[PDB]
Amino acid sequence: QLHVVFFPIMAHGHMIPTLDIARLFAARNVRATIITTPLNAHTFTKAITIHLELFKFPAQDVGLPEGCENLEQALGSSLIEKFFKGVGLLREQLEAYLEKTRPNCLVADMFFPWATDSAAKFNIPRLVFHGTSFFSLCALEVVRLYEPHKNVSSDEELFSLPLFPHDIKMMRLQLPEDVWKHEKAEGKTRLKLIKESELKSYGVIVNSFYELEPNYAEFFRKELGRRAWNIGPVSLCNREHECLKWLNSKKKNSVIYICFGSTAHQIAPQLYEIAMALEASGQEFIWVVDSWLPRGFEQRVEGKGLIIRGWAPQVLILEHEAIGAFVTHCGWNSTLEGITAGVPMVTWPIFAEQFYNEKLVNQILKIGVPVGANKWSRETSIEDVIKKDAIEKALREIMVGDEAEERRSRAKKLKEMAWKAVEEGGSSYSDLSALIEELRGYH
Ligand SMILES: O=c1ccn([C@@H]2O[C@H](COP(=O)(O)OP(=O)(O)O[C@H]3O[C@H](CO)[C@@H](O)[C@H](O)[C@H]3F)[C@@H](O)[C@H]2O)c(=O)[nH]1
Ligand SMILES: O=c1c(O)c(-c2ccc(O)cc2)oc2cc(O)cc(O)c12
Ligand SMILES: [K+]
């Protein structure tokens, strides 16, 4: 019986798909163990036999609050750099656990480049998992290597991405200031080691499907030389609420869903602009979130608009017939869920690799419309708030704009292809079989 150990970073966006991968492996009669920390254990226990191993996270040692065991909670350069020091200090526990258990494979988070050598100490192959699209993997590497943002003179000047079979235009504002304004050696070295681990390790597991982005599934393997397996969307593996009853009464494709993911850190002025745009648009909506609402808002929109304050059942909402569009930050799990539900998206990237995912959705898949956000940053400065008019424009365009029906038709195709990829005989099913067979024969 093969044993594969999974080691995601403590971020919801990596933890949930890593659990889905562990489940996909477990369904093939592979023993799957997931490493996490105490304050994150519930996330897996609730979601779940896949075994959990708890490591101690040295928060105090790196100057974090004891309760800061997840990446979303480390807001700001100081806290973020401390968090990465902290996770780097898990290496001793990882190596002790590997020596003790001797698994056949380690699937480790992109943020752990050192995991490669930790596994090599015991002749164990290591796979990298990023939780993002082939397109983002390729675009980030081409930007890192060719630095096409050096050839510009203004924040808004458009440059093309080198080498790609599509002409993808981007601007400096869409890149972290740490890369183009005031170089911090720390982030740059971090990114270098991450991208290098893709070639130094045994290979890369990708939560995507070949038919979704074939040019980039190929580019990653050919022009960039990585060994990769596409096994996603991994969430389809394992496959009421008051808002769903609320939706049952409504016209097909008539409601807009708005949600900014797990890393959502949104300020009151921004929410205020969103509220005004939603009211002015006349569109029915489910919005996942006085000081941030127009007075009388929730009563004025009753029956047409719903604000969800807690966790929303995002997949169940997107797959409800009444939901016709998705305003998203273009985190890859949300983007994939929109694709699998066949729901067109208004793209609102914030940080990380979300601006690359936005390019994939709008220019290549052609299933979305941009809201107009073009500034990369962890937190929103009040001077960068996206205004009511842009938001209303996007809300109208995604429902009744030019090519809106075409976007709906294209997304329906991708929905079909996604389900086909994961069923027996599909490309993702097949690549998972291929990967597991390769792991079973490793010497
Ligand atoms: O109210 C809610 C809110 C969310 N969810 C679910 O949480 C998931 C969100 O993952 P997503 O990629 O969109 O957000 P996030 O964790 O911020 O992205 C980081 O992780 C991503 C993956 O690596 C990365 O692409 C991105 O750049 C990072 F910022 C997604 O599966 C939703 O369905 C829900 O069910 N109910
Ligand atoms: O792929 C990526 C990714 O998954 C994550 C991520 C970041 C924060 C989270 O909370 C969860 C995930 O960030 C990234 C940052 C990059 O510069 C490049 C990437 O490719 C990713
Ligand atoms: K090359």
UniProtKB/TrEMBL annotation:
Transmembrane segments: none annotated. It holds the Pfam family UDPGT. This is Glycosyltransferase. PANTHER family: GLYCOSYLTRANSFERASE, SCOPOLETIN GLUCOSYLTRANSFERASE-LIKE. It comes from the Eukaryota. The keyword Transferase applies. The keyword Cytoplasm does not apply. One of its GO terms (molecular function) is UDP-glucosyltransferase activity. Keywords: Glycosyltransferase, Transferase. It comes from Phytolacca americana (American pokeweed). Its EC number is 2.4.1.-. Belongs to the UDP-glycosyltransferase family. The gene is PaGT3. CDD domains: GT1_Gtf-like. It is an enzyme of class 2 (transferase).
